[PDB]
Amino acid sequence: RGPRRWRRTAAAAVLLVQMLERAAFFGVTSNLVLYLNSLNFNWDGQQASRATLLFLGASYLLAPVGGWLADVYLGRFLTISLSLLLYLAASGLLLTTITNDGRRSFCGEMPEQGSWSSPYCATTLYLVLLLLALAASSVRSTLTSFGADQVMDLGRDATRRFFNWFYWSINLGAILSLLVVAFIEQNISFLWGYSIIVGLVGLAFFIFLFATPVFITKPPTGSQVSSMLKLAFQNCCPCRGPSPQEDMANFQVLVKILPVMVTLVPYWMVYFQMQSTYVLQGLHLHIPNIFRTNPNSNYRIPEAWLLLANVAVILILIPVKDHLIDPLLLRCKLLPSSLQKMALGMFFGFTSIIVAGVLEKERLQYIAANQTVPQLIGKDLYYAAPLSIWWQIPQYLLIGVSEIFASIPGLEFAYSEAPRSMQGAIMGIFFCLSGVGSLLGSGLVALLSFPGGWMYCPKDFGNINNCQMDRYFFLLAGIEAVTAVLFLWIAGRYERTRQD
């Protein structure tokens, strides 16, 4: 019974460790801003937003670096070990920074503008965030690769099911983390929240350690990035250790896979910016009220339960989506290619953003009637509209369906078409391109923030009343449509190369 034992226990352990790691990551990034803006660091809100954006970007852009450092000589198991160790170290060091003793011992003393580094304990916190992001990205990439290695040849449909329940466990960890950790952080001292975070991290590390006799591995592969870029140049340059045949094969497969992820970059940009603007729009609705009643205990809504609702919408779909649709399409034999499933996901995303633009048009026309209403989520009061947050539920359902249909075939394709060696490398490159799209969308929002722009309401202390985001929604829709067209073209090209 040993075979099935090790297989299923390894799958379950990988799922649980990824769940705990994503939980820790979400628990951190949900209230990193509030932690920075606390009375113990005196950081400015602009600096906190910059730190959060740079943290996300650094994580996403260091994912490929960590995956490559793994795949070159480090090995997936040892890389997960060291990355979880670095994650635990960063979490514990941040926990000690929370304590006044560690705070004064590590980065000087509390001081007696912009990039001048006037915020207290700037360099130490920046290095901590960089190391934590690198560790989280390495864990994510190498653990996805390891779980796919586990759910290898025994079943390909089993591999698809594995990616499905993998995203499901990610969403479950996200839900648990958001709810519990955010409640603890904004209602009790941050010490308890970060302590339970570092405890979850240590528990996940110990589970991974225990799983060692169960987890299976392979010898380290080669094809360093030096030789990779050298052959790429040689193929590309005019006059201005594996075998070379294996390096050429890896280069060819990389050339094949690159356009797909490059065309996926705009989709990830649109998705991240759409999630952000959806949170922003839901913020300005009539969110239901718990016993706090905010008359101008357990008050200060955790500001992250909208993301919790979104992740819950994404979650519920996954099991029913799989169980119904996959056997259904299998028996109906109208089964499309993974690229066409991504196209269907992009179409569902276009539908969701159109519905969101219409909903925002209704919201703005309702505000035009001057039927304002106050509400205070977090530490920032916002004026809202008489509309209800329950109208955001259909568009959240649509965007969740889109996200699932795009993401599951995404990683499925990314792993399957990749060669056994370059699996984690292409996973890391996929994460890097997703993060590059996210950063490009943030930069586009920054350019739109320019005076005379669609989003230029400064005096509104950061409320979307005077700002006009309907045009922004329509532009996102158009960009998504163009991206879908280009993706169909790249998919046809990839199919023609596949038959080649």
From Swiss-Prot:
Keyword Transmembrane helix: yes
Transmembrane spans: 9-29, 53-73, 78-98, 119-139, 165-185, 196-216, 251-271, 301-321, 339-359, 396-415, 428-448, 472-492
Gene Ontology molecular functions: dipeptide transmembrane transporter activity; peptidoglycan transmembrane transporter activity; symporter activity
Residues linked to a glycan: 187, 296, 370
Gene Ontology CC annotations of this record: endosome membrane; lysosomal membrane
Subcellular location, record wording: Lysosome membrane; Endosome membrane
Tissues/organs with expression: Expressed highly in bone marrow derived macrophages, and weakly in spleen and lung. Expressed in plasmacytoid dendritic cells (pDCs) in response to toll-like receptors (TLR) stimulation.
GO biological process: dipeptide import across plasma membrane; innate immune response; peptidoglycan transport; positive regulation of nucleotide-binding oligomerization domain containing 2 signaling pathway; protein transport
Pfam families: PTR2 (PF00854)
Catalysed reactions, as listed in the record: N-acetyl-D-muramoyl-L-alanyl-D-isoglutamine(out) + n H(+)(out) = N-acetyl-D-muramoyl-L-alanyl-D-isoglutamine(in) + n H(+)(in); glycylglycylglycine(out) + n H(+)(out) = glycylglycylglycine(in) + n H(+)(in); carnosine(out) + n H(+)(out) = carnosine(in) + n H(+)(in); L-histidine(out) + n H(+)(out) = L-histidine(in) + n H(+)(in)
Keyword line: Endosome, Glycoprotein, Immunity, Innate immunity, Lysosome, Membrane, Peptide transport, Protein transport, Symport, Transmembrane, Transmembrane helix, Transport
Topological category with respect to the lipid bilayer: Multi-pass membrane protein
Cited function: Proton-coupled amino-acid transporter that transports free histidine and certain di- and tripeptides, and is involved in innate immune response. Also able to transport carnosine. Involved in the detection of microbial pathogens by toll-like receptors (TLRs) and NOD-like receptors (NLRs), probably by mediating transport of bacterial peptidoglycans across the endolysosomal membrane: catalyzes the transport of certain bacterial peptidoglycans, such as muramyl dipeptide (MDP), the NOD2 ligand.
PANTHER family hit by this protein: OLIGOPEPTIDE TRANSPORTER-RELATED
Family: Belongs to the major facilitator superfamily. Proton-dependent oligopeptide transporter (POT/PTR) (TC 2.A.17) family.
Protein's name according to its UniProt entry: Solute carrier family 15 member 3
Species assigned in the record: Mus musculus (Mouse)
Gene: Slc15a3
